[PDB]
Design an enzyme around this catalytic site. Structure first.
Site, PDB file in Angstrom:
ATOM      1  CB  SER A 131      -0.912  -0.078   1.252  1.00  0.00           C
ATOM      2  OG  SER A 131      -2.074   0.725   1.138  1.00  0.00           O
ATOM      3  CD  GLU A 155      -4.993  -3.412  -5.129  1.00  0.00           C
ATOM      4  OE1 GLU A 155      -4.847  -2.505  -4.262  1.00  0.00           O
ATOM      5  OE2 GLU A 155      -4.175  -4.376  -5.230  1.00  0.00           O
ATOM      6  CG  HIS A 163      -5.351  -2.210  -0.655  1.00  0.00           C
ATOM      7  ND1 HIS A 163      -4.444  -1.656  -1.538  1.00  0.00           N
ATOM      8  CD2 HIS A 163      -5.113  -1.629   0.549  1.00  0.00           C
ATOM      9  CE1 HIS A 163      -3.667  -0.807  -0.891  1.00  0.00           C
ATOM     10  NE2 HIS A 163      -4.052  -0.775   0.378  1.00  0.00           N
TER      11      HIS A 163
END
Length: 294
Positions: free
Chosen positions: A144, A235, A265
């Protein structure tokens, strides 16, 4: 079609989610991530260390190779996450890669805005080199925001003369702080994981969102080591990853991008109940090992 576990996990995540729009205060988002984190596997050995003035853990699955190490940069929008939230997933990457992970608790925004996290990442890397680990025995990984920080840490390191490690694996990277990519619209309905723009706002604290160390998708990638990029098809950050891959390719970097179909994700973090989480972690390990044999 899609596996039963992902369908199931998609439903649980839709059920547990706070409704679109409602503002969750930061320390409440922080505590919730802590409280819901998976406990690391029982055979994961941990050792607390201080690294460039940050708390860290060495995270050692069974089977660690002497001389090997992963600098691991956790997710959490640059505003949340910790050693705790990620000890579990990082234990499994250490298992798969037969390498110990350095799990860094880097400074978080808004208390410490950009470039605090990049300074911590780079110093952490310098610390490893200083400790005697050879560049060719090193890898950098993160998910991320952390996966954007991977890239930022490399670019910044390259710029200061540091040698590149043997590999880097961004997992679902957030590499573009503008959040303008098509996939925020295109993949919106499929993604159960506004909210993100606030984090960028909090991290930047006024800085240029196209700063190369904030958004490595606008950076010069020349000279970075070989990359495995992981991202799920389902995502909003699909585009960050597709565009990061093309950037890398253009800048002459050896990039392998894998879009996992049906995946969300950082589906890796759900390895305890997602076969694909384990599968993708295994693959991150294989790739780190491949790059170390070469």
């Amino acid at each position: 079609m899609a596996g039963p576990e992902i369908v199931k996990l998609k439903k649980i995540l839709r059920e547990k989610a706070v409704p679109p729009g409602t503002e969750v205060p930061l320390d409440v988002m922080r505590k919730g991530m802590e409280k819901v984190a998976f406990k690391a596997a029982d055979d994961i050995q941990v050792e607390q260390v201080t690294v460039a003035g940050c708390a860290a853990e060495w995270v050692r699955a069974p089977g660690c190779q002497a001389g090997k190490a992963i600098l691991y940069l956790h997710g959490g929008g640059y505003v949340m996450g910790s050693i705790n939230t990620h000890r579990s997933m990082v234990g499994e990457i250490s298992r798969a890669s037969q390498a110990a992970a350095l799990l860094l608790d880097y400074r978080l925004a808004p208390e410490h805005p950009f470039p605090a996290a990049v300074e911590d990442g780079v110093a952490a890397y310098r610390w490893l080199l200083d400790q005697g680990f050879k560049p060719q025995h090193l890898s950098i990984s993160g998910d991320s925001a952390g996966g954007g920080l991977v890239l930022a840490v490399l670019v910044s390191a390259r710029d200061q003369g540091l040698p590149m490690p043997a590999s880097a694996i961004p997992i679902s990277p957030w590499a573009d702080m503008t959040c303008t990519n098509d996939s925020f619209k295109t993949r919106a309905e499929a993604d159960p994981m506004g909210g993100i723009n606030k984090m960028a706002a909090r991290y930047l604290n006024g800085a240029d969102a196209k700063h190369p160390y904030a958004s490595p998708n606008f950076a010069n990638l020349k000279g970075l080591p070989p990359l495995l990029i992981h991202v799920g098809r389902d995502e909003v950050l699909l585009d960050d990853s597709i565009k990061l891959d093309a950037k890398a390719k253009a800048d002459g970097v050896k990039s392998t991008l894998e879009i996992w179909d049906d995946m969300i994700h950082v589906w890796h973090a759900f390895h305890p109940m997602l076969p694909e989480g384990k599968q993708a972690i295994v693959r991150v390990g294989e790739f780190m090992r491949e790059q170390w044999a070469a």
